[PDB]
């Protein structure tokens with residue numbers, strides 16, 4: 001998904017920064033410690049209200065770029081009993097009979113995401129992955145969370161079996177389980193401005209209010225989104241009729 005929202009003061013740590021470190025950068029740039037600083041609709045320290053950044057139209061945004069997916073090796077659980085039934089022959093004559101054996105399996109699709117430094121995005125992230133075995137999976141997800149959705153597969157199989165004279169005979173419904181997954185990542189980028197108000201006129205021309213691009217006052221202006229999309233499903237259903245065993 002293409003996300004673009006305001007950067008907040010409580011997310012400065014996500015850019016390895018702080019209001020104090022931003023203020024100190026403004027101090028270095030202009031040669032006087034500002035009274036206060038401003039970001040979008042917020043201020044910090046001894047600041048002019050309303051924020052000079054909104055007054056003067058200088059905003060600052062965090063962005064999620066294009067999500068890139070990388071397939072992980074698929075893990076296959078090669079045998080799982082979904083159903084098991086035993087036919088008992090208590091007579092002196094064999095009989096043959098057609099039975100139906102039924103199992104159900106609950107498929108899961110799981111999304112998880114995070115950022116390396118703890119950005120606080122509000123807009124849902126769109127995650128879509130087509131899995132070979134599991135098929136198409138999509139999510140609209142809050143970054144930094146986990147979600148699982150479920151779907152039910154019921155499988156019935158008819159089978160004709162002869163059970164000898166004094167014996168029982170077991171029938172199983174079996175499947176393989178595929179855990180399919182892909183890792184994903186997206187660049188986080190910050191662009192726009194911070195504001196500062198000074199106790200005296202500073203800078204070229206002598207002004208009380210100044211704006212500097214985020215890159216001038218923050219220790220970094222990028223980060224990273226990461227996550228995984230998993231699907232667990234059953235496939236390769238088989239009927240197993242085991243040899244008749246004596247009672």
Ligand SMILES: [Lu+3]
Pocket residue numbers: none
């Ligand atoms: Lu194959």
Ligand SMILES: [Lu+3]
Pocket residue numbers: none
């Ligand atoms: Lu196959």
